[PDB]
Structure formats: C-alpha cells, structure tokens
Amino acid sequence: MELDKTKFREMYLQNDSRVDSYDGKMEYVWNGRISKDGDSGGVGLHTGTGTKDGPAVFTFDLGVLAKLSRFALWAIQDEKHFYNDMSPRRYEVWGCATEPNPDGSWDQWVKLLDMENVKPSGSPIGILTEDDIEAAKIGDQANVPLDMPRVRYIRIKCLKNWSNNYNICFTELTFWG
Amino acid sequence: MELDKTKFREMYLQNDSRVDSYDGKMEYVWNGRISKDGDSGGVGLHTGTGTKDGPAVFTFDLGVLAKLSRFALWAIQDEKHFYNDMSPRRYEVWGCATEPNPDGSWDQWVKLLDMENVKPSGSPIGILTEDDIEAAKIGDQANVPLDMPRVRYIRIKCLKNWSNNYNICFTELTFWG
Ligand SMILES: [Ca+2]
Ligand SMILES: [Ca+2]
C-alpha cells in the first residue's frame, strides 16, 4: 500500500537544515500535490541557496512502523527546477525504528537508498528534451531492498543538487510498504 | 503522569502562524528546558513582530490519546520577556481526538482552557517585583476540567500578548494526564 501521508509528521533534530525558504514547509512534500512555482496550497520545501558546511539533512516520522517497498520523489514541476536550481541530484534516504535521538547523530540510522536523479538526455543544465520532462513528471523511483529493517522515522540527506551545492528543494515524496 | 514529550510532533495546518522567528522552532517548547535568551539548545518559539489579521494559532500532536489533567506554560525566562515582549497574556488551549483537517478550520476542535497570565503586582510594563518574578519561574498552571474529552492534537491561540498584539513567544509547555 501507499503509506497514509495524513499520519506523516515533521521532526527537527539538532543540526538539521531548515526547509522553510521561499515560503516552503516540510508538510508540503506529503500533501499529495505534485506542484510547480505559482501553484496554491504550498509548493514544496526549500533549504535556500546559502552555503552550507555539508549536505542538507532533514527528518520526519512516517507515523507507522512499516516494511518499506518503494520510494518516489518529484522535483518542483517547471523548467526552473527540472535538473536545475536546488533540485536534488545525489541524495540518500535513511531510516530507523525507534525514537530518533534529538542530538541528530547518525548512529542509530540505517541507509535505505542511494538515489541519483539521472537526466535521460544528459544535456547541459538548462536544456531539456521531451524524455527529460517525461522522466521528471514520473519522479525518481526506487524499490527498497527486502533485507532492510522495518522503519518508522526517515532522514533525507542531499549530497549534491543540480547547482553543485548542498541545498535541496522539491515538491512531493511518496512511500509504499 | 507527565506526557512523554519525546512523542510530541509539530503540525502545520493552513493559515497557522509560523513560529520560527529569532531562530525559534516549535520543538523547542517541548525540549524539557525552561530557557532564557542566550541559552544553548533552542530557546523557544516565536511568531515575530509583524502585524497579524487575528490571534496567532499553531498546532501540534501529543503522540498519544490522553485524558488531560494539567497544563503549564513558561515565558522566556528573562526580564525582557516577563509580562513583556510577545509573551502571551490571554490565550487558549484547544484539542481534538482525530486527525486534524489540513484546512485549519476550527470546526472539529474543542476549547480545553481559557488562560490568562496574571502579573501579581499589577505594575506597569517594564516594572517587576519579586512576586512577579517568582510567578514567572513557576509558569502559568491550570487543571483541565474532568468533563473535557480525551485529546491527541492541540492548538494554542494567542488572543493578546503583553505588547497588546496577536504574536506569541515562549520557552516551554507541559501536559499531564
Ligand atoms: Ca507536495
Ligand atoms: Ca523549551
């Protein structure tokens, strides 16, 4: 099944990135809307454009203990953001089963997924083919390996975005399990 | 019993006030620390000083369904904030038992408590007695009536703060039940 996004909850551990730049909010990435700039109802989350010391990190609660099967993520749905801007290019999804320590340490977390947003055409930043746009509307898609433990809490870490920095912005994610 | 603050979670319903001014964050009002400006570890939440159209409102999840018995709230613990600044003066606590509608409507919520932060000395703003200080370390304190329903979700509405507007800032709250 698709996990029930009405149960998802923002968390904030020490050293996590704020995600509320450009009127963003973490709850906007589980509002069931895959949005673009100018849409109503909260477009997505956004850490900003300022330098960071390392990869952006944020944390949330699925509200259920689940055996995960699949994961998807969508960039904000316009040319400004497709394979561009602060959209994520290399990123990770991590999980754990018991309450996250508020100090934000990685110790208890397990890495579920190594994600790469691949641009089908491989065109330079700012050029898009019809296949690049199609892929962006499908979203990044992954199956979670069967050996992963059941998890309830999630972290996303942005290793690099499409502008070669550590910020991240996007519109929606979905979990199944 | 004191409700387990490790389980509390921020929510964000449409039209809720952002509470992240001055490096604030909602989770700082259930971190177990009753803090003043300059302290480490997140001082409190703060909606800013912009003029609002109405009472500031924000929402959170207790993480359990509880029969509530008591509520307490502390202002940021220094003379700048005691009966001053954006510290709450008249405010309300509201609750419900089932998932909050994300449209932020009041329809499903029930008002649990009418709170007033009373300044013992009644002195003008900026003047503090020893009694006024002692009361502010003890915090606002209320018993929740036995005829209230069990609730899992909470809203706080700031009708008026000590600067005669709708903003709110404070360092910690506690629920028992
Ligand atoms: Ca969304
Ligand atoms: Ca606190």
Numbering used by the authors:
A (entry chain BBB), B (entry chain AAA): 220 to 396
The study reports:
Herein we have identified eight Sus-like systems in B. thetaiotaomicron that share the feature of a homologous SusE-like factor encoded immediately downstream from the transporter/lipoprotein duo susC/D. Two SusE-like proteins from these systems, BT2857 and BT3158, were characterized by X-ray crystallography and BT2857 was further analyzed by small-angle X-ray scattering. The SusE-like proteins were found to be composed of a conserved three domain architecture: a partially disordered N-terminal domain that is predicted to be proximal to the membrane and structurally homologous to an FN3-like bundle, a middle β-sandwich domain, and a C-terminal domain homologous to family 32 carbohydrate-binding modules, that bind to galactose. However, functional analyses with BT2857 and BT3158 revealed that the SusE-like proteins exhibited galactosidase activity with para-nitrophenyl-β-D-galactopyranoside and α-(1,4)-lactose substrates, that has not been demonstrated for SusE proteins. Using a series of domain truncations of BT2857, the predominant β-D-galactosidase activity is suggested to be localized to the C-terminal DUF5126 domain that would be most distal from the outer membrane.
The BT2857C construct crystallized in the P21 space group with two molecules in the asymmetric unit, and high-quality diffraction data was processed to 1.42 Å resolution. The structure of BT2857C adopts a β-sandwich fold with extensive loop regions and high similarity to the equivalent domain of BT3158. Structures of the DUF5000 or Ec domains (BT2857C and BT3158E223–P440) were compared via the MatchMaker in Chimera using the Smith-Waterman algorithm, yielding a RMSD of 1.225 Å across C-alpha atoms, and a quality score of 0.768. There is also high structural similarity of CBM32 with BT2857 (2.015 Å RMSD), including a calcium binding site wherein the calcium is coordinated by the side chains of N250, E391, main chain carbonyl oxygens of Y247, R252, T390, and a water (BT2857 numbering). Intriguingly, crystallographic ethylene glycol (EDO) that was supplemented during crystallization and used as a cryoprotectant was found in an equivalent location in BT2857 and BT3158. However, there is a lack of residue conservation at this site with the exception of a conserved histidine, H265 (BT2857 and BT3158). Notably, while not sequence conserved, the single Ramachandran outlier in BT2857 is D304. D304 is structurally oriented close to a channel occupied by D256, H265, and Y241. In this channel there are three conserved crystallographic ethylene glycol molecules that are present in both molecules in the asymmetric unit and could suggest the position of carbohydrates for modeling purposes. This region is equivalent to the position for carbohydrate accommodation by CBM family 32.
